[PDB]
Amino acid sequence: SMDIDPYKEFGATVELLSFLPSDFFPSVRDLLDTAAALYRDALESPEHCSPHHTALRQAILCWGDLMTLATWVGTNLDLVVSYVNTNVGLKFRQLLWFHISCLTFGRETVLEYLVSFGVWIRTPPAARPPNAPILSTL
Amino acid sequence: SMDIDPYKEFGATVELLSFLPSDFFPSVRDLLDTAAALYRDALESPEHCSPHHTALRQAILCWGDLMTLATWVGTNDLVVSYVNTNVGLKFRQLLWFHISCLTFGRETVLEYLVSFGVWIRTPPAARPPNAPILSTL
Ligand SMILES: Cn1cnc(COC(=O)N[C@H]2CCc3c2cn(C)c3C(=O)Nc2ccc(F)c(Cl)c2)n1
Ligand SMILES: Cn1cnc(COC(=O)N[C@H]2CCc3c2cn(C)c3C(=O)Nc2ccc(F)c(Cl)c2)n1
Structure with a gap:
């Protein structure tokens, strides 16, 4: 019935x-370790902090639930715990990355970088500079 | 790992x-139909609107993913049963909390939470016949 873009309120889109x-x-594994290592005080905080903080909290907790289900399938039976890493994995990797990068480097900067990198990676190797463009706050 | 309370930033807790x-x-089924019928324009909006709006969006989309997984398991009995038992309650709690916080007001939903839990725990013979009422006035 409804069509909601997790990214739309943050000036981007699923596409x-x-x-x-x-x-x-x-x-x-590495994205949660990074959110923890950088933002645990703020994520666990009893303040909104930012819309990015709100979204990321839910994303982390949701990944929890999806994994608790996959674990519970394993302790109540292979191809199921494989499906998550294929399809949902990409989804949460995208979403965790977007939000962490938006808190670290700045939303506007992460949006430029998104197109920057996609254009470059699509340029065939022989014609493109040897290194990607760089994501940074300075 | 970390310990995050979805409700903590909204002045409540999982407990x-x-x-x-x-x-x-x-x-x-009824909670998504209600969010749609009341908030579709705001939920689909490209504006934050409120922290409740942000959280609910993710919750709805997440329930989508959890069900897509359960459906994909079925198209590949007790698995699609487990979701309705354990995760179902979790999302029912979370969808309800956020919709009720948008409709009636956060502060009002927090009072009502204790109000109802005290009353429902009072044995029937001693408690008024109707629950306390959740409303805007
Ligand atoms: C020559 N120069 C000038 N300034 C800088 C610093 O920039 C980088 O090296 N950027 C690295 C660090 C993080 C990073 C880099 C490149 N990309 C594509 C990323 C990235 O976004 N990774 C990333 C982002 C968010 C995350 F949560 C995690 Cl786990 C990883 N180099
Ligand atoms: C002066 N007065 C007398 N009556 C009223 C209106 O109140 C109710 O009838 N309350 C009912 C209607 C909705 C409701 C009620 C009691 N509870 C616990 C709820 C409720 O929270 N329902 C609800 C809330 C959020 C939802 F998303 C959905 Cl699908 C349902 N005002």
């Missing part, structure tokens, strides 16, 4: 993030 | 919502 190839995204 | 019995919560 735009599917621009970046699936192998550009860190692991889930 | 507090587990106060209300599981059969007090509308269905998921």
Whole structure:
């Protein structure tokens, strides 16, 4: 009945993030470790902090639930715990990455970088500079 | 790992919502139909609107993913049963909390949470016949 874009309120879209190839995204394991190492005080906080903070909280907690289900399938039975890493994995990797990068580097900067990298990675190797464009706050 | 309370930033807690019995919560089916019927324009909006709006969006989309997984398991009995038992309650709590916070007002939904839990726990013979009422006035 409804069609909601997790990214739309943050000035992007599901299509735009599917621009970046699936192998550009860190692991889930590494993305949660990074949110923890950088933002645990703020994520666990009893303040909104920012809309990015709100969204990321739910994303982390949701990944929890999806994994609790996958674990519960394993302790009540292989191809199921495989499906998550294939399809939902990319989804949360995109979403965790977007929000962490938006808090670290700045939303506006992460949006430029999204197109920057997608254009470059799509340029064939022999014609493109040897290194990607760089994501930074300075 | 980390320990995050979806409700904490909204002035409540996971414990507090587990106060209300599981059969007090509308269905998921009915909760999404209600968010749609009341908030579709705002939820689909490209504006934050409110922190409640942000959280609810993610909750709805997440329930989507959890069900897509359960459907994909079925098209590949007790698995699609587990979701309605354990995660179902979780999303019913969370969808209800956020919709009720947008409709009636956060502060009002927090009072009502304790109000109802105290009353439902009072034995029948001693408690008024009707629950306390959740409303805007
Ligand atoms: C020559 N120069 C000038 N300034 C800088 C600093 O910039 C980088 O090296 N950027 C690295 C660091 C993080 C990063 C980099 C490149 N990309 C594509 C990323 C990235 O966004 N990774 C990332 C982002 C968010 C995350 F949560 C995790 Cl786990 C990883 N170099
Ligand atoms: C002066 N006065 C007398 N009556 C009223 C209106 O109040 C109720 O009838 N309350 C009912 C209607 C909705 C409701 C009621 C009691 N509870 C616990 C709820 C409720 O929270 N329902 C609800 C809330 C959010 C939802 F998303 C859905 Cl699907 C349902 N005002």
